[PDB]
Design a protein around this ligand. Sequence first.
Ligand SMILES: *P(=O)(O)OCC(C)(C)[C@@H](O)C(=O)NCCC(=O)NCCS
Lengths: 96, 192, 128
Amino acid sequence: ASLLLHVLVAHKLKKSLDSIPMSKTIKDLVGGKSTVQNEILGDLGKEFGTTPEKPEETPLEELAETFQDTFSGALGKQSSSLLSRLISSKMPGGFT
Amino acid sequence: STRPLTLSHGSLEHVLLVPTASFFIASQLQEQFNKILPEPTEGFAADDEPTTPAELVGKFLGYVSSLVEPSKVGQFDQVLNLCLTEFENCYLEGNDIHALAAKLLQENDTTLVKTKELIKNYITARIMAKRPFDKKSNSALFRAVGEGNAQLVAIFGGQGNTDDYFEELRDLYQTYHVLVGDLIKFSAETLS
Amino acid sequence: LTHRNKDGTGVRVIVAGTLDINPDDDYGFKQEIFDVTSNGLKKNPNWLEEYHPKLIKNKSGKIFVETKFSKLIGRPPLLVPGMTPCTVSPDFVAATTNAGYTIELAGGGYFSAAGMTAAIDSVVSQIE
Ligand SMILES: *P(=O)(O)OCC(C)(C)[C@@H](O)C(=O)NCCC(=O)NCCS
């Protein structure tokens, strides 16, 4: 979950997998625009199902654990749909 | 006296009943259209390629609507008027376009960018083929305000709600070009 | 922002400017304006009216505070809860049950099925 969460957040911020430090709240990373914040929470909602209460107030590091329990290396709805785009929309010209 | 034509992209199609009177027009648009839209890829995930039959017909309505003139009666007017009347009777079942855009978004693996263009295409088409919105729509909410169930209040926002408000004006103008074009134009003159 | 100020007053906000989908379905998007089916007229809960406490009578003519909870148990919506010393006694559990009020026997003062079964049996012997 600690990798998958990092990637889902990294992808929504148009930012590199190390420019996001895990020891930092979601409302910290997108403090300005509140749209992106909720849009991240909507994505974690689809991806891992059940969330804590005020997930954008607990650091990703801390929140990754809470998911790690009830999730089992499942890509699920959102991540699968992001890879389906990544391949087809980028130019693995023939190889799916 | 009719004749079948099949708009298709990879695995999905809409079968389209063109009066043979105006077929040599439509089949020339079909091949011109069938080369612009890209190579089918699994899931139909890439932003350009449509994901359902409903989107594919919409992509067409747009491409045809981009060749009509709003005054000059050209060749494509009756072509477009029999893509609309198909699209409205298959996929809208006498609802609004927005009610359809919703369904696709929670059923099928469409995105927002994918469903924004479908609303652009349909509403462009409706106006390029002189069919202006004049029917007092059967909106559940407004049937409910007449009956006296629902009370409505309008509220308007202000500054502070976004970093770039101007992307809201751009996205609004990109999609409802054919409804707001006149109000935008009026403001631009009235401020200038 | 207005939605969160008045969640639970019986007011639905519709964001007339954007088309998206609310997972929670707390507030609406553009669709709700245009939609023709019953999926355009949705109401939000009015907690003061949903869960308003009422009164109600028996054939005997004995009044009850009617709530979600009292409607299930047929007794007033007051429970003496499980307290280790206090509701360990089956003589207390019986008196409170007799009276007409819900009460927990307390596991915390029992050390074995045998011991508790003797307690539960002493309760059943005394209640109506
Ligand atoms: P997010 O939870 O941060 O979204 C809500 C919001 C902070 C954008 C919204 O509550 C907000 O705009 N707050 C202040 C209201 C405002 O912008 N006032 C206008 C300045 S004249």
